[PDB]
């Protein structure tokens, strides 16, 4: 196995395949075949594959080398470096200028494969749309819930919409985007690690994203990268059941103003429970906080509100999380009563909605 490639062609691919990819799981699989270098990393649950065209003379073969070391060596080389590589003995030799490195290898035959599977559902969409779907909901995923499926993200197709849903039982996020293709009705749960990877592979170019879903796997193609992940089994909660049936008390406020008011009040909230009280009245919101040390915060804001007066408690971090995710100009809070959840949305868009359950 021999290749010679410019540093600038290896770097992004090495970076993409290298996170996080027992010993052999810390190696990358390198394969030279049919004018292409393929680089593969896996953790057994998921897999990233990059392809690199070889325009310089090369020779076929495969090996496996430590991922961090190989990436750190390539990255440490100077701008415009050419990186010549050849297998030799039980070692892989890397040359550039008068820098020489000899890396240990494990057999390509030892490198694990994900089981083969069949695509059942397929669609294409813009990078920016997938970025939008994930960033809108990611923060509402559970971290280490005993209900494992809540630790991932639901991806749902309905009509011509792709939808993400994330929830931890206390708060929920849902975002739906049109993708201009007739889809089957279908839902899968992607583990949190897969969501992180799916997000990482979106470079922000004009390269579209091609998705393939099997019964137990999901695959995303963008540019010369193919990411595959196993799915999570379980009964993900239905966001339709969670959205308030009729939250006809409508409050609108400036997002930055509302956020910074909650942020200040939060300073004097209980350090563990983080409770704040909202008092809504005619075109006014009062936010209060206090803690066991009898310290007290009070914020008063002008808002648009015509409905009946009410009082309601929330974990302030949940509210702040929504506002930070929204990045809006104006926000609408849609209320029911003191003991029911609140729906929160950007006043200008209904593409995303957030539901937060109150505290007593």
């Amino acid at each position: 196995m021999k290749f010679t490639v410019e540093r600038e062609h290896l770097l992004k691919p090495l970076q993409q395949v290298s996170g996080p990819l027992l010993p052999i799981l810390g190696n990358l699989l390198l394969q030279v075949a049919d004018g292409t270098l393929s680089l593969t990393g896996t953790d057994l649950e998921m897999e990233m594959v990059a392809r690199v065209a070889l325009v310089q003379p090369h020779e076929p073969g495969a090996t496996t080398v430590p991922a961090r070391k190989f990436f750190d060596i390539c990255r440490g080389l100077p701008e415009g470096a050419e990186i010549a590589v050849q297998l030799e003995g039980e070692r892989m030799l890397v040359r550039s200028g008068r820098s020489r490195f000899s890396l240990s290898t494990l057999p390509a035959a030892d490198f694990p494969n994900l089981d083969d599977w069949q695509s059942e559902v397929e669609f294409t969409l813009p990078q920016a749309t997938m970025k939008r779907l994930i960033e809108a909901t990611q923060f509402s995923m559970a971290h280490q819930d005993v209900r494992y499926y809540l630790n991932g993200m639901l991806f749902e197709t309905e009509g011509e919409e792709l939808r993400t849903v994330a929830t931890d039982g206390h708060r929920l996020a849902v975002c739906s985007m049109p993708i201009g293709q007739s889809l089957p009705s279908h839902s899968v749960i992607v583990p949190r690690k897969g969501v992180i990877e799916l997000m990482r592979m979106l470079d922000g170019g004009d390269n579209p994203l091609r998705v393939q879903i099997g019964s137990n796997n999901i695959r995303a193609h963008v540019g010369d990268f193919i990411f595959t992940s196993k799915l999570v089994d379980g009964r993900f909660p239905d966001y339709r059941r969670v959205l308030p049936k009729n939250p006809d008390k409508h409050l609108e406020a400036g997002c930055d103003l509302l956020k910074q008011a909650f942020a200040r009040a939060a300073i004097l909230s209980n350090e563990k429970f983080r409770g704040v009280r909202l008092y809504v009245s005619e075109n006014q919101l009062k936010i209060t906080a206090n803690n066991p040390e009898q310290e007290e915060a009070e914020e008063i804001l002008d808002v648009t509100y015509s409905g009946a007066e009410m009082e309601i408690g929330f974990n302030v971090s949940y509210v702040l999380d929504v506002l930070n995710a929204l990045k809006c100009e104006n926000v609408r809070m849609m209320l029911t009563d003191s003991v029911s959840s609140v729906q929160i949305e950007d006043a200008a868009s209904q593409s995303a909605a957030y539901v937060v359950m109150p505290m007593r």
């Binding site: 929830t167 039982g169 206390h170 708060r171 929920l172 909660p237 059941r241 969670v242 429970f273 974990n315 003991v339 959840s341 539901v355 359950m357 109150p358 505290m359 007593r360």
Partner: peptide
């Protein structure tokens, strides 16, 4: 804290 489901 109350729950959604």
């Amino acid at each position: 804290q109350a729950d959604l489901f």
